[model samples]
Target: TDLPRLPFDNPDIMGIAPQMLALQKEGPIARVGTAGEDAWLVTRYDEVRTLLADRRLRLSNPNPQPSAKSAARAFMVALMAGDDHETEPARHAQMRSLLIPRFSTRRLRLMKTRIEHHVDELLDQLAASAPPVDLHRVLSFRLPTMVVCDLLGVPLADRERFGQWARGTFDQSDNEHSANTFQQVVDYMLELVARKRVEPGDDILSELIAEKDGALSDADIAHLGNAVLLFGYETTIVRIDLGTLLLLRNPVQRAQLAEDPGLAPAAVEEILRLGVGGKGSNALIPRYAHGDITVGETVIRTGDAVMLAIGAANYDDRAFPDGGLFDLTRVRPRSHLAFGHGARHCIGRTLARIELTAVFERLFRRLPDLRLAVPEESLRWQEHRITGGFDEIPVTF
Candidate 1:
């Protein structure tokens, strides 16, 4: 099952892998991969949705202790930590219930005021910078880093180091760096846990400590808080950078954001569904089926690995008419699984929406002349990295 990676050249740089569009015609699931290994790539919107919620498919790896040295290994290990809920269905439900209040819609809604402060401060810095400022550095990186740190109780001094370790953990290629950073984060969190014991502030970790139920250890609390913090800091950065680029590339869509800031929320969703370039790779979302399951005309036997190409599903024309176009005016569809779906649907999406709305609304309103400092062709995309975005979004307002 060796197929040339679908979007062979990415000439337009939109990162829409045309092969996936073709896969929708071939079947519901198709065998596609590099040599030496193969996995069923789920195509079509409805089919991917079905499997994302299916009990038979899970991301849990066979318990051999994920190598403790690789990025993939660090990723899985951290994923299962912090009241880690990957063990059994019932326990997973219990963990979800316990943590729901922390991410409740009310909590996220209340965060809007604080999120605006972070957005405004960051944008001020962007505006003050000299021409050709790197938006990726000033806005994309700082906004989420500060918001999550403030929420998680990470001290101001540690944010620079915290962001560094988070980047190292996700670099994908460097095993030593990834593993070391993973351990570094754990070590830092453990220390923070000890401090919170003495001087717990009004933060998530502090609230967890007040329970005194002893269900989670310092390590557990550290990993749990850090897990959320990690996703908050890292993934959001990618989205902001990618979303900015997506709008910049599409002049009409970019102009619409300025025309009506009320549309910021819907605009953010479109960017999320279209951004995070992973249309050709099988590395992003890996799932293993626990039992045989049939979809369309094919059967996936137990233990078979499946790649739920969320990026592909977002582009399925059957679901979104003319899905290739980046249209902010299209009706906001809840079906797009950008943050995932079912039991594993991301709990942090509300917070994400808050941050994204602030960026889209304020940035355009403040800097009406914002545009790319570099040509679209010259800009670098993280094509090989597990997550995708521009390395440096050089822009001038």
Candidate 2:
């Protein structure tokens, strides 16, 4: 059977692809083509949520293949892929148990203050800079890097070198370049883990090293460090840039946020729900089904790769009425799937929330008249990058 290739060709940076919308209307489950392989794409809210939490659907593919859509994804899968899929769930749970406490409420409260301070410093620099400054460079890019570096005990001075490598990992144009850079990142983390073994600092890496007298192997620790550093900041950077754009485009919502700082949390969620735009096929999360599973009259046979389109699911009108519209006041019983459901949910979610809330709460409040320095159409979206956003967001106050 013929299938539609994902990312459905929507030109608007802030709008959902019409093709994905049409597919959702057609059925909840459909076979869709991806850059690497053809798979079943779950677009409806309920099915997407159900599959995300299903243990039968595994993170590690039993038969893995390169993702033409994103080399970064392929690298990520390689990092977690195991020969024995039976131990995957227990291994995942063990890792989460060891690391989850690092992002606890007490820890985040302290990090929250630091985030606010950093936001103030970045915005202060922005206020002092010349007109038409790149917000992506000054604020969106710097803040998350700083936070992640601080958390992981990586040297802030090495940011430029490591940041370049991080960006290279996401480059879809060149697979070899992406793979090579991903190794550099892991190698860097390996060295950092070595340092923490001796000169242990008050950081996550140090804690991981000390957990149960090194419960994880050195290679394991380094890989985990690499994952945290890349994901902790990389995805947040996109959200900040796009979240700002979303608010800027909607005057009423922007006004509401600026008037009341308390609304930052809800505003951030709305931004996340809508931030998946222009992501194309990158919006779908790839998982391998370990057993035959039935969903809405379709049986996903064992070992089939299932692409969960959380972005499209978030926009399903059955769950989110007027899902296309940005409403900070919009309320629903079930939350948006910006973060996956159940066990596979994003680990850095709380940290992301803190970073996003701090930025929105203070940014507009300080510069009430902040406006885009370029036409909305003129902005260039990162089509090749796994995490989607503009290459630069030029703004002025």
Candidate 3:
């Protein structure tokens, strides 16, 4: 029989994410790739899960060729693809240990109120006018961008330009998107780092600069700040707009949620899983074998790029049998790859947890009757817009 076909027709990687879960059930492993790319698609829950945590698998070639790789290769952070994962332990501990304060439960608890305040404020501005409110512009897009600017040392004076820079930062164009825009974000961050040196603030950027021993160089500090700002803005932006859409479409589920505000915690998890994201058939993980290997009917080569579908693994029947249908009472949300897993997992998990939970709790309480102002078919959607999210989410109270 022919091997199971892979899901890759989606315009972006985000669209393919949830479908991967359904594909995983067909066969433990499958072979798939993009229009013009070479990578193996791992669909089984255990295989993908084990591979993601396994350090033996590397994402890059021994010596990358500029001519061979895409622009995305140049623009992304290599933090996940550390050398051999041998000395990464010490370095990981150093970098991750410093983040303890950034994600401290206490810090998130404090940030929670702020997140709610911002959520309500946006809702107020939105509801005052009418039903046709752009949820993305009114809230989803703005909140995280605002929080990120506050977290980093950037001035509020630059708020209007934040989206401009954010847009250029994640372009998918083969030419400038991979190179020109990459430098633009770096140079922008470096300029801020330099400015902060003479005049520090109470923000994370200032804290890193003031580290007693100057543990982070100017470049290192800039990278950290960029990562923090980008990661925070990108995830939450999608969470609020898309998360609510998921809630709106499932009236039965939404009604159930309204009956019991106590369901807020699980609702957050459900939304997190349902949140839309970028999509692709790119493999940044590859493993070398010391000996031969075997799994479900596939042979192993010494080294090959492996793309483990996060969406597929998360939706695996093993994780959630009827997960295809969104349900508020999903008790096994712990089995999610929404934040990823293992040492390289998201460091901002706590803050994401805080903000998402706060968004749901306050949103439902504030607008228990919130619904889509426009028909689902009429909603404006962003396509292949790397760093995925809605173009505009119209809603009513």
Candidate 4:
């Protein structure tokens, strides 16, 4: 049987993949080929939201397979290794309880001041540099690394080393190198955990160390910190690169944001919603059906692979009127599913929002003349990786 394979092409850099848009019109759930096998692709806002929060859907597949993409995902799973079907719920709840308050609005508000300060410093450095600079290196990559380092108590001086390891884990060309890099990340975090045990500081790692007591082992703390460090910055880095492009593509919106800095929050939400960073298989999340599940009219058998297409759902017209268009003034700007919904919703969401809001609020206000240095079509994009972003976003003010 033939299947519609994912990451349908979106030739237009700023537009949602036409294949995803087309599939959503056919039905909420459709069987699509991802990696190598067939999986149910949930593309509508309602179904994606429902299934994301459904305990019946499991992140770890009971029956695993050897495929190129699964191997790539395995690199990430190995970093935070401890989840199983039987004890995941209790474990997840416990971890969330321990970690959630640290990311609360009140806590993040204080961090926002620091985040804004970092943004200012980065922009100052950017202004000092010559034109046609790689914004990806200068601002997008640096800001998140600094923020996550501050949060995790990892020294900023060691960023270049771990940052290399973080990028190495995503290199699809060589699995051995990626795996070795993943280990380096774990070892580095393990060392950090030991240091914090003796000389603790006022950071997430130190707090986790003090709070966990014997609840989490040193390796577990290392894995958790390793996971946070990797997951924390990569997505935001991609978002910043893509978000800047989105704003530049829409001059009217960019002008509006520049005119009234108050629109930064709405603009950030819209950017999060409309940014088409990940492509193909990378855009869809992999999960397994723990039991017989009926989503709409389709019955997914137990152990069937389910791919949640949050990117497609964000652009579902039923959820957002004219979802294809990127309008910051939309009534339901917050309705988008950029951050997955339900119990496993992204813990870094508030931090991401704070960072994005800080960037957008000041970026254009500081340099109203910011524009792409090269033609849009000529930009180089990262491929065959989980998260999509430009290799180098060259821009000038």
State which candidate has the highest lDDT: 2
lDDT of 3 at 71: 54
Model 3 Cα lDDT, one tens digit per residue, 60-119: 443333124345433443433334334445755666666656665665666778777887
Deviation (Å) of 129 in candidate 3? 1.9
Worst 10 residues of 1 by lDDT: 61-70
Query: Which structure is stronger by lDDT: 2 or 4?
Result: 2
Better of 1 and 4 by lDDT: 4
What's the TM-score of every candidate structure?
Answer: 0.90, 0.94, 0.85, 0.94
lDDT of 2 by residue, 1-397 (tens): 5579865788787766888888899889988876667899889998999999998897776665533445676766545533347677777777677668888787799889999998999999999888889999989999889888888877777777776665678777779999899888988898898889999987998988888887778888887787787777878888899899989989999999999999999999898888875655556887888899999899998889898989898888988888888899986535989878877788889899899999999988888889999998888777777766678888889
Model 2 residue 84 CA deviation in Å: 5.6
lDDT score at residue 46, model 1, on the 0-100 scale: 89
The list of candidate 1 runs beyond 4 A from truth reads 1-9, 62-69, 81-91, 278-283, 332-334
Candidate 4, residues 66-165, lDDT tens digits: the string is 3345344676655434246566667667766777766766668778998999899999999888898989999999988888888877678777877666
Residue 11 alpha-carbon offset, candidate 1, angstroms: 3.4
Pick by lDDT: 2 or 3, better one:
2
lDDT of 1: 0.72
Runs of candidate 3 with Cα error greater than 4 angstroms are: 1-7, 10-22, 63-67, 79-100, 277-297, 378-383
For all candidates in order, the CA lDDT equals 0.72, 0.82, 0.63, 0.79
Q: Would you give me the overall lDDT of model 2?
A: 0.82
Q: Deviation in angstroms for 108 in model 4?
A: 1.4
